[PDB]
Amino acid sequence: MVKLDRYIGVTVFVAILAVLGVILGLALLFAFIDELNDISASYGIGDALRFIFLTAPRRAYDMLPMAALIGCLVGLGTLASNSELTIMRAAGVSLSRIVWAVMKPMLVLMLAGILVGEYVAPWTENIAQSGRALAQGGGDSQSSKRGLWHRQGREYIHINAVQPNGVLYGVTRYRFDEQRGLESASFAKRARFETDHWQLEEVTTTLLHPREKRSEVVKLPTERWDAQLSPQLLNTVVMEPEALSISGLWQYIHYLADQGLNNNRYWLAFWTKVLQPLVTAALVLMAISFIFGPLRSVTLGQRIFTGVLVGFVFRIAQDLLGPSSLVFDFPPLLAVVIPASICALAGVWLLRRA
Amino acid sequence: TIDYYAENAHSLQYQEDGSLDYEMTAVKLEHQKATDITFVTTPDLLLFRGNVQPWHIQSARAEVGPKGKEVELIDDVRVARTDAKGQPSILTTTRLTVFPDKNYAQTEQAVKIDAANGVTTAVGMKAYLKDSRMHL
Amino acid sequence: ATLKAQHLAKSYKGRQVVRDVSMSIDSGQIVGLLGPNGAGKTTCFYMIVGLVQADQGVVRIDEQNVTHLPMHGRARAGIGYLPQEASIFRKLSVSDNIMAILETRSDLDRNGRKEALEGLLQEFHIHHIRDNLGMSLSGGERRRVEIARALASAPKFILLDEPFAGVDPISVGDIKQIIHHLKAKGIGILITDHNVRETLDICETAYIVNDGQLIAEGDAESILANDLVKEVYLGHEFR
Amino acid sequence: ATLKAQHLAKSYKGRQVVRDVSMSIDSGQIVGLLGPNGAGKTTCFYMIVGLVQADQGVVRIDEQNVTHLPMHGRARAGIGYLPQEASIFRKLSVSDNIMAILETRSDLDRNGRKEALEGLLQEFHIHHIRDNLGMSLSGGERRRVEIARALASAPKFILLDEPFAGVDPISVGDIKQIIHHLKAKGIGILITDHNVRETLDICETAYIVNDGQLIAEGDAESILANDLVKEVYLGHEFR
Amino acid sequence: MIVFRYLSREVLVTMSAVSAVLLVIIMSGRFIKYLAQAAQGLLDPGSLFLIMAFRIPGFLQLILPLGLFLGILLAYGRLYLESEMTVLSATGMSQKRLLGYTMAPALLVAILVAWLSLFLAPQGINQFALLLNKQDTLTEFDTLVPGRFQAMRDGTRVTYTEELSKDRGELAGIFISQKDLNSSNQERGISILVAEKGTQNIQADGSRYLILHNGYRYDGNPGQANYRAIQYDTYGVMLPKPEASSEVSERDAVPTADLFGSDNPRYQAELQWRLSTPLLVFVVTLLAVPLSRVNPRQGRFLKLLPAILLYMGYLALLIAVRGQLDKGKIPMAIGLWWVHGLFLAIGLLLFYWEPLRLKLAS
Ligand SMILES: CCCCCCCCCCCCCCCCCC(=O)OC[C@H](COP(=O)(O)OCCN)OC(=O)CCCCCCCCCCCCCCCCC
Ligand SMILES: CCCCCCCCCCCCCCCCCC(=O)OC[C@H](COP(=O)(O)OCCN)OC(=O)CCCCCCCCCCCCCCCCC
């Protein structure tokens, strides 16, 4: 059986591609509208457009399962509403064979999606985030909400922005006394990570002599400070947990568990990233079950509407079950397992119903 | 309400060049929420570098608005010149409308100069803070 | 082979539709199934096909109980099916329309598959259109291609549904010619249709179902003579 | 009253489906409209009804150019209509089903409206089911109620569309009786469907359109004896 | 007069069902964010129910017009597919009569939405704010971890604590740095706070006076000589609630009675916004009738997503115009009504398409 498999696979694949394109376009438009509020004469409209276009791959990867569900629904509905699946069944083919024929392109798409996620989404998402942070953070002592505080010894650091090439922007650090009396307050315009140590550029430190003696100001163009933070950790502590690679999530989870800090959110992100193929398979199975049962001979509009509604309900359930695991101390794996299992069970029931 | 309050504060403020702006000690600092008004009970202002020679102040109470537009010295008012002349030239009146933003010496009432060698009374006070010269 | 449905019976949500209906179709003979729309003619036809499970009764084909088998199980058993509405693979050429089904057959090999496809194309006079897409075919050519596709599975009984519905009088001749051509090969056809005149014209015997129970059966002459049918389905004025 | 359609012509995307087809219905007579499915028969019927705008021609009724009037404008001008599928107000009692239309008639008062509703109910032998909802009625009662409502609109010409579609031979007599009743009332009727036997039996005339042009006309005897229609539409084997 | 009741009942029932579904969806969507905030440490889970109960009317005030839009679409699509409306039109009922028939449920929904948006959303928001101004913030400053930087109120302010007692109080070296996004002059730019121990004092009338055991207060800029060093023993600064008014501006809580006459641009813009919802309901009713004509080929559900998108765009344009008008750029004389005019014109053109084409064909 070669021609029927190709027919079904091509139909579903093209439908999925079109649905994914439309969904990604709508998501990009909504993101642009929502983020248009941040223009401040230092973050131009071109910058926002560049950020959105660079963030597109991450959102496409995130929304791939919904596109798969809706596209499979539409394609199978197009096939069935023309009395073609009935002919195939009456010719000897079986529902298991039809499900396999639909799933094979789904397997290819799942492999492509996992690869794209874990090998591209981090890179482009990081590039976009770094660009936006650099655009918004070339300001003053502490003038960005994309910043990053820190503390070592008795000196409290700040960082306006962090760049992928091991360069910081606007490093302001306060040095105190054992008596908690301030002694200095510096502001370095940039910083670069020489392998041995951090190097500052164009600092403007001001020294406050404790006593009533004269207060002075000094300017060292290339002052050098030895700090504990490292570029690799900095590039990870800022990015959202859901934007890291699978290997990056694994490494950060182990690094956190090493020092005793909790990592439930990172466990949730890792489980949601690694178990996506199972969720996609369950969603496609539920869609196939819908086609053979209730939505047997309904119009295309009803198929699209029901697919969108089911996708919205599933997304809301899985999003509410995410933080709920952290709040209620649920194992993070359940928040991912539950909705997919429910959808697969419902699909299997409706399929057994014939 | 009061947004921030302090007890037995001993604050320092430095000039743009680096010289001391003043050294004020107050019993309590109160900043109401309705306006940026700070009450400094019993201030001890000392313009250490405002005029090189400190201007000792022993005002019983001082009222400060959002800015130093009118830091009025209410109740006991004292101005110990402490300049090259050994005469304190302490002025008491009831209030002294110092102008930190304007930086001028003006009196809200008749000037009562309690000098060392001789005490004199003058009407009004119009004298530059930097100059430090007697002027009605 | 002799398809046999014995004591079929189904009940819908509220009321019974078919009760104690028995049928029998033998290879090489055409059997029509006619009755009032409210009757259980359609439900009996679909239960024989397998679309709707039958509460009671056994549907067996030559001493092989296929009552519990699914639609594809029966299709492998030997039964066929031809839906009334258009059921042609729109984006597949006619040659592909036939070869896609021809692939599923287990016995055939590549050379055998190609030879069978050529024979089927020549048999039904669709050679000239062996490249047109399914969506571009007319009613007559579409029906010929559909019948060729149905035959490509090598069925033992083909259950046509409303063959004459929505066809002008000129095309009913071609439809009847196709049905007789199928009957010549040995297949047995079970026609259900609204057009009683043509169905009785072609079918060799007819089964009439009134309220879930078949009320008459026999040749066309006998069916036209029964008074119960004349009072329930045909009417006195008929013919 | 006479509903005249003159030189009707309609061109779809790039094809001229109908070209210069002229028909005329006179009050008190039944006129049929038959032809092959592909040809311009349904298109002409709709251009007369108002569901498709005519590129050329004038559909005038009693010297009113009603080609441009919308469907409600025609309905107020005298013409009527009756959709092929069931079109009864589902969740509305039959009496309310007719009164919903009776209330619109301007030239009536409350007592007059009640008397007219009673006359309509007793004239179509649907009085006993006067309280049933629209969902309960079966085929015959549903058709009778729909006809009673259409009449309650008080039309001049009633354009039936496929009245003999999927009806048992026994029930066709009731529809023929209803059509004869309407004709006796003095209402010109236009009928179109694929039942070339019942339509020719009931109809007083028939217009056959093939390839978008009128190819024949006249009573059933002339139509059947005609040769062009036989070769293109009816087929030699017919009759 | 029977078709009037029939259509009104159909439209009202469908609108009620769609409104219930939309309300459930929206409430779950916002509960997602609230639960995320609670899991992050802020907020108190016990107060979520009250927050949602007091915020429901604000959701309804915007859901109801969309509910009516979709209900009209679904009901009239059903009546078109089942041939009832074809028979209605083939008997005399024009489309202006149909609009008149459908303008009764629209009027009832407009009355309901006006009541909501003018006398229940303000009171609901006021109660929400009053019951949110509670121990929630007192919990947040108790959420401090001995090694975490809680950047309260975006990037303006931060908070730190080397060591915090489990029972609260007797904190270790505390560091609090606040920056003002305004001009800030020079000294007001950055102001840090360091106290050796620090403590929290519950106000007799206020929320909490964080009492610092001993420390300093520093003001100025990192690259400037002037620095106001304040040395104290006890220092007290209240802790504002992170969500006291962040998600609810005071413009919403003011009763509609006070909005009249006030020359404050924000108040007048809010008053114009409050009156826009009934007009929106009537406009959606006007432009939902012609769009409800669907043949069986394209079904009944095809044009629901585009309708939702159109309604969302309408609301977004209204809100953007309201903001740019309350910020002073758009003159108040033109106001917010030109958006209503634009959508009324588009709906009117959509409604008169068939008559215009028929007149075009002589
Ligand atoms: C930095 C990168 C930024 C990328 C930004 C991307 C923005 C996307 C916005 C798209 C908005 C418009 C969507 C247009 C597509 C839908 C239109 C439609 O109905 O198309 C139907 C068409 C039918 O296919 P046809 O060629 O007719 O073949 C039929 C086979 N019998 O269907 C088709 O097959 C044609 C449509 C194909 C659409 C392909 C695009 C969808 C997936 C895009 C993923 C992009 C990111 C993925 C990762 C990239 C990593 C580098
Ligand atoms: C089948 C579906 C049918 C329905 C289609 C949808 C039609 C809806 C039409 C209405 C669209 C609503 C758009 C809402 C925009 C909201 C903008 C906003 O909130 O930002 C306001 C922003 C403030 O800027 P400001 O502060 O003045 O700048 C100085 C900075 N201190 O202001 C600005 O900076 C303004 C700059 C705007 C630049 C263009 C932005 C793109 C807008 C695209 C909207 C969608 C268009 C889709 C059309 C499809 C038609 C078929």
From TrEMBL, chain A:
Pfam families: LptF_LptG
Keywords from the named record: Cell membrane, Membrane, Transmembrane, Transmembrane helix
GO cellular component: ATP-binding cassette (ABC) transporter complex
Compartments, as annotated in UniProt: Cell membrane
Domain of life: Bacteria
Biological role: Part of the ABC transporter complex LptBFG involved in the translocation of lipopolysaccharide (LPS) from the inner membrane to the outer membrane.
Listed name of the protein: LPS export ABC transporter permease LptG
Higher taxonomy: Bacteria, Pseudomonadati, Pseudomonadota, Gammaproteobacteria, Pseudomonadales
Gene: lptG
TrEMBL record, chain B:
Keywords in alphabetical order: Cell inner membrane, Cell membrane, Membrane, Transmembrane, Transmembrane helix
Localization, UniProt: Cell inner membrane
GO biological process terms on file: Gram-negative-bacterium-type cell outer membrane assembly
Main location per the UniProt record: membrane
Bilayer topology annotation: Single-pass membrane protein
GO cellular component, one term: plasma membrane
Single GO term (MF): lipopolysaccharide transmembrane transporter activity
Keyword GTP-binding: no
Subunit details: Component of the lipopolysaccharide transport and assembly complex. Interacts with LptA and the LptBFG transporter complex.
Similarity-based family: Belongs to the LptC family.
Protein role: Involved in the assembly of lipopolysaccharide (LPS). Required for the translocation of LPS from the inner membrane to the outer membrane. Facilitates the transfer of LPS from the inner membrane to the periplasmic protein LptA. Could be a docking site for LptA.
Name this protein carries in UniProt: Lipopolysaccharide export system protein LptC
Residues of the full protein shown: 44 to 179 of 190
Automatic annotation (TrEMBL), chains C, D:
Keyword Membrane: yes
The name this protein goes by in its record: Lipopolysaccharide export system ATP-binding protein LptB
Gene name for this UniProt entry: lptB_3
GO molecular-function term, one example from the UniProt record: ATP binding
Stored SUPFAM superfamilies: P-loop containing nucleoside triphosphate hydrolases
Subunit-level organization: Component of the lipopolysaccharide transport and assembly complex. The LptBFG transporter is composed of two ATP-binding proteins (LptB) and two transmembrane proteins (LptF and LptG).
Gene Ontology biological-process annotations: transmembrane transport
Domain of life: Bacteria
Keywords: ATP-binding, Cell inner membrane, Cell membrane, Cytoplasm, Hydrolase, Membrane, Nucleotide-binding, Translocase, Transport
Membrane topology: Peripheral membrane protein
Family classification: Belongs to the ABC transporter superfamily. Outer membrane lipopolysaccharide export (TC 1.B.42) family.
Role noted for this protein: Part of the ABC transporter complex LptBFG involved in the translocation of lipopolysaccharide (LPS) from the inner membrane to the outer membrane. Probably responsible for energy coupling to the transport system.
Location(s) in or outside the cell: Cell inner membrane; Cytoplasm
Gene Ontology CC terms, in alphabetical order: ATP-binding cassette (ABC) transporter complex; cytoplasm
Pfam families membership: ABC_tran, BCA_ABC_TP_C
Domain ABC transporter: 3-236
TrEMBL record, chain E:
Major site of localization recorded for this protein: membrane
Bilayer-spanning residue ranges: 12-32, 52-77, 98-121, 271-289, 301-321, 333-353
Keywords recorded for this protein, A-Z: Cell inner membrane, Cell membrane, Membrane, Transmembrane, Transmembrane helix, Transport
The keyword Magnesium is assigned to this record: no
GO cellular component: ATP-binding cassette (ABC) transporter complex
Subcellular location: Cell inner membrane
One of the GO biological process terms: lipopolysaccharide transport
Membrane topology, record value: Multi-pass membrane protein
Keyword Transmembrane: yes
PANTHER family: LIPOPOLYSACCHARIDE EXPORT SYSTEM PERMEASE PROTEIN LPTF, SLR0882 PROTEIN-RELATED
Family assignment from sequence similarity: Belongs to the LptF/LptG family.
Described function: Part of the ABC transporter complex LptBFG involved in the translocation of lipopolysaccharide (LPS) from the inner membrane to the outer membrane.
Oligomer status and interactors: Component of the lipopolysaccharide transport and assembly complex. The LptBFG transporter is composed of two ATP-binding proteins (LptB) and two transmembrane proteins (LptF and LptG).
Name of the protein described by the UniProt record: Lipopolysaccharide export system permease protein LptF
Organism: Pseudomonas aeruginosa
Gene: lptF
